[PDB]
Subunit: 400 residues, 3 copies
Amino acid sequence: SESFLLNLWILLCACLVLIMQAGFTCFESGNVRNKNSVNVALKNVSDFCVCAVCYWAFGYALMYGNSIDGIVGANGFFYSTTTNSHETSFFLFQLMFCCTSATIISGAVAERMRFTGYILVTLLAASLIYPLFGHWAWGGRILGSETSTPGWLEQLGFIDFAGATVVHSVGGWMALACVLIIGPRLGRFNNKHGVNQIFGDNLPLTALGTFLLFLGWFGFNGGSYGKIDDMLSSVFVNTALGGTFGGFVVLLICIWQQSLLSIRFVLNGVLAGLVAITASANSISSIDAATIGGISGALSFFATILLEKCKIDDVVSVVPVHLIGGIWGTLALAIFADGQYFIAGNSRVDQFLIQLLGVVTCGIFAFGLPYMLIRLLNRVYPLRVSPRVEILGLNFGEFG
Amino acid sequence: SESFLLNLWILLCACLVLIMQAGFTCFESGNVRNKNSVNVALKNVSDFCVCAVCYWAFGYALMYGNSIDGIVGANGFFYSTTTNSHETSFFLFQLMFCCTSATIISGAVAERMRFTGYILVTLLAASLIYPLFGHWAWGGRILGSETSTPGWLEQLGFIDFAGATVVHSVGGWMALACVLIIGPRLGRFNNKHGVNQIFGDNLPLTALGTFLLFLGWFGFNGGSYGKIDDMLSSVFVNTALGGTFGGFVVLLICIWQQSLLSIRFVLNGVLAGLVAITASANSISSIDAATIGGISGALSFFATILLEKCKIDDVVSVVPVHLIGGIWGTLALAIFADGQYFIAGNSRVDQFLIQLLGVVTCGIFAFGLPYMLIRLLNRVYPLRVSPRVEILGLNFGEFG
Amino acid sequence: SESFLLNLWILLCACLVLIMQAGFTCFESGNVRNKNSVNVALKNVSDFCVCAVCYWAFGYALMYGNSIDGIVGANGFFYSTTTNSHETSFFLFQLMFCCTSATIISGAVAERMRFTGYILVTLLAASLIYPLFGHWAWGGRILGSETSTPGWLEQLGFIDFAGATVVHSVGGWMALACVLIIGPRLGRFNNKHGVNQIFGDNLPLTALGTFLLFLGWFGFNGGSYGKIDDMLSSVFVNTALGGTFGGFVVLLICIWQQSLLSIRFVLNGVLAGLVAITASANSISSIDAATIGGISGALSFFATILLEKCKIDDVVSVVPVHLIGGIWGTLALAIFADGQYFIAGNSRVDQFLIQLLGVVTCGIFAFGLPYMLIRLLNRVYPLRVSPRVEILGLNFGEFG
Ligand SMILES: [Cl-]
Ligand SMILES: [Cl-]
Ligand SMILES: [Cl-]
């Protein structure tokens, strides 16, 4: 039966996506202080299970089900059986994407968000924000379907190969809302323009985590390809170049400017390069992959510094990596991608405009609505830990 | 040639099984104190090599060779060549299973078992217990054989898709024998009903380890499927749901009862869910996978507390995860599995009875015989470290 | 299209090779002191990105391009498009090999080499040494080419299945040059024959790293196979036996001689066994894989002790593992490999002689030339950190 190879491919790609969970756990846990080390681990596994349960129970239905009004899908609840012989593999892969998007959120708020806060934000992400935006961008993109209808953004021509916007930007916007609402760590910023660095206690784990993320990204992009043809290997090369030029560019910056704890920035550079090529890995050349990735690295470095100037404390640099990288990648698609991947009646300017409309829509929905709901939640159920718990650390203070 | 795809699948699944070794190393090492950190690592790599050598030299022969009397197989020693074009891939995968079962044993006895004790218990597991029980349950299940004869349990109808009993229960029973014989850590229990917690010093590594185990489990189940058809992806979905509902259920328990160091229990919940679906991933629905996994999570939580009440010190909760999860999964198969996977002349009651006979046989052989031999060994070659070595830690005390 | 399965195989094997990067990071970082922990991580990610950029930009061209004079290839710069439907997958896999070879170098010089020194040595490796030796040994071995010409060593009959010489020996020779030039750590050796051990502070990570390397090695060997046939699974079995007998033999030595911190040696044994079978995994029996791997383990143990006697400080034992294992594997091919894999007009003696010529050529070029250039560089740009930085540690002293 023909359908075997593609199913096996998707299943293996889904496995690689799951290693990104290990990667996030390591990346975050090494960027935090020992007194907070256990919290990050509990949240990463807990967040995963919650997200999976939600996506299985109804998130897949909302995102990929037949569209009632075009807002939201309305079938595929408690996913089990299908007549589409690619759908089960696809469901598993898409479940891993949902888990990715939500996991992304949690690294920004480290060292001062209460545990039940991670859970409630994860619920919001998995239940509403991710599947709804998902439907609008990718609602019609069901592997092996005969019967599918495009989401409204998708129909206007919005392109996102593997989720620079759908996964990465959605996570990043929600992370930005979270850090603005809970506020900066004690001791991070002082009085006028004072910025103290707070360094993780297990930074080798952050390099392990960077390599695990990089590995998982091959599955992330490779499993989104929708088929097999002789151009699949070009998605892999472009993934490798995106990440490596992201890091290499930051390395050049960093040698030049003699950055202290340069390890944080080069590692984030790699991740930003990977995020940026996620929109377009299938539609660009190797030179353009290097270019897009490299620029994303540079953007991540400058965005990190900008956030500090704004007194926003994003512990692992979710916003510089995922949000700025994801916006950059989504727009860059219009600039660099071979025009044959666009709508026939779209020029590069037309593609730029719809990529931008997607970016803006994502910001309004994934920053705007969470910002309002999380601010509401926080008035009646404070999300920041007590000063005592922050000082002593979530390990002893929160988890005894 | 047709046989290529299945061979490549098995080889990749075997690779995933090997990442479970990394996962066990991290899971255990994070649950132990720094003064013992090196011991756990030395034992994990050492145990692997010993087990592999044994399985290659003769364990495969005993487990899968043509059956002399039905007790034990008697060909395939020093495995090299075959006329079965699937046998070499299969041998490698089965070798990784043997290594899995033995590795499982070692986390229960942490912080007070002498190194050479791990080695001798590993020898017992790999040489006798695992391959013999293996033969009885799976002796006929040689990928691509024309000529095979079923083991006696297998012949009566005993079902175990990927080893809830064969791998997980066997390891767990041997772990239980080991902890009973070496006894509890100093400072764990006091006088009447006193229970002191002893917490690991690198618990982020235990989350890394949980994700690596979860990833490896896809290979563990996927490589046991015996073929490819369009239902393979359902084994993957059921694996994902088993693990995630295991963790999710414990999370619900834990929020409710406000558990201290909840991270230990949610992580074990995930592993218990995975163990439970290992018996039946190919024969149940997605809803039943969630159900079986979820119940396994709950059982693991309550079993953990029960063992403490019995003053049994199982450091990483091998028995709650692997043994209680494995027994539960093996019995649950009769309750939930589609009856088409049973013998034609078996009802659910008949299947329940043979699943139970398998459970009991496993306990008698894998707990009973090791308990007796290890107790004998311990009289003449004490397996517990000296109090000085336990207090100072196996790193300095044992490994200088 | 037929070419799909092999491409997917190569891409997945390349993914496994990338996990070796994670493995090296863990292996080295656990063998170093906490005060140096961050440096090792920064160097591992930085080294990767640099190597990738070089290999993409021109290293692939030098190594695999059409041969101008036979010294060096001269096309394939900024690799992008091809008419060979296997070439892109191959390029990615070969890029990961180049990164492997260079990464290997860096663990020997830990705790006292300046960061910019790692970068400059990496540039030398990736720009000149690896691709040029690569061309001579493997220049004609382009997956799916019709038009290829063999490198001069290759033409004489030099065999190296996956790079015991090309990857491992090249890295090891360059590592040896580096440690001789920067010299031993402060406090390592004293006066006459005094040897103080300096132990890593996170040795559990070195076991994680050993398992990740072992896993990646399946991809390393499997992706070098050049095709699919029914003997591919035998390369996997031989990989498993090589590594496990390497460790098992050292375990036997170590129990016997009661080695302190035995974990370091057994782990290195496993890696040495894997390195040794890298030359011949496709051409030997399972018994010979065990034999070659086992001997490599023993050699690694004795080489470790020898280097200490010579007052050479190789922190993670790169030279005992990669160089001594790689030389041993390359020569062992002549001894054990089925003669059908040789040139028709070559006996075992003829094969021995060309394997030896390859070994010697590699030493002259990959030790001799780097030794001279790095010694020159060091006169004008000292590669060793200041005593203050070594004592305080590269984390604070170098990275603030
Ligand atoms: Cl935190
Ligand atoms: Cl221990
Ligand atoms: Cl260093």
